Curated annotation (Swiss-Prot):
Functional note: Peptidyl-prolyl cis/trans isomerase (PPIase) that binds to and isomerizes specific phosphorylated Ser/Thr-Pro (pSer/Thr-Pro) motifs. By inducing conformational changes in a subset of phosphorylated proteins, acts as a molecular switch in multiple cellular processes. Displays a preference for acidic residues located N-terminally to the proline bond to be isomerized. Regulates mitosis presumably by interacting with NIMA and attenuating its mitosis-promoting activity. Down-regulates kinase activity of BTK.
Gene: PIN1
Database matches in Pfam families: Rotamase (PF00639), WW (PF00397)
Name this polypeptide is given: Peptidyl-prolyl cis-trans isomerase NIMA-interacting 1
Domain comment in the entry: The WW domain is required for the interaction with STIL and KIF20B.
Entry keyword set: Acetylation, Cell cycle, Cytoplasm, Isomerase, Nucleus, Phosphoprotein, Rotamase
Length: 144
């Protein structure tokens, strides 16, 4: 299977699913360019490198509370109840929020390493699960 993918078994159902340990993506169905383009939604927490954003001068949520927020945004995006662009614009603690989280194109050697690795392991159109860096917790959408 492509880079990072392993076969696993569901806790509730017993059905096979697939888990990517590089993007933290998981999906039911069976699953490198010089440059990729991604958007993200960042949720900072009290242990972030810079616990401050356009949304909130002092970010005080714990890492666990950030992960809970991230997982709720993933659920809404996957259900189609909200789209990624809209939750990024509204809720991302990154300054790219004002561009629907779009970061433009980048190559390896530019981003923090867990962000880069996840970005380059996603398929075009594919969204990560929670990705952790010193900025905080991310949802990454690879758009090209
Ligand atoms: O201030 C910055 O520009 C970067 N920081 C603080 C920081 C500083 C050094 C290392 C890691 C994080 C952030 O926490 C941050 N990271 C991002 C980020 C992370 C991954 C991809 C794109 C943007 N955005 C932000 C932001 O405030 O707007």
């Amino acid at each position: 299977l492509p880079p990072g993918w392993e076969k696993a078994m569901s806790r509730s159902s017993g059905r096979v699913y697939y888990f990517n340990h590089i993007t933290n993506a998981s999906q039911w169905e069976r699953p490198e360019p010089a440059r990729v383009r991604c958007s993200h939604l960042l949720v900072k927490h009290s242990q972030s490198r810079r616990p401050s954003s356009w949304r909130q001068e002092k970010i005080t949520r714990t890492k666990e509370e950030a992960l809970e927020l991230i997982n709720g945004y993933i659920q809404k995006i996957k259900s189609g109840e909200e789209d990624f662009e809209s939750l990024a614009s509204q809720f991302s603690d990154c300054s790219s929020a004002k561009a629907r989280g779009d970061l433009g194109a980048f190559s390896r050697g530019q981003m923090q390493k867990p962000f880069e690795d996840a970005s380059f392991a996603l398929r075009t159109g594919e969204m990560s699960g929670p990705v952790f860096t010193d900025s905080g917790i991310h949802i990454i959408l690879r758009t090209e």
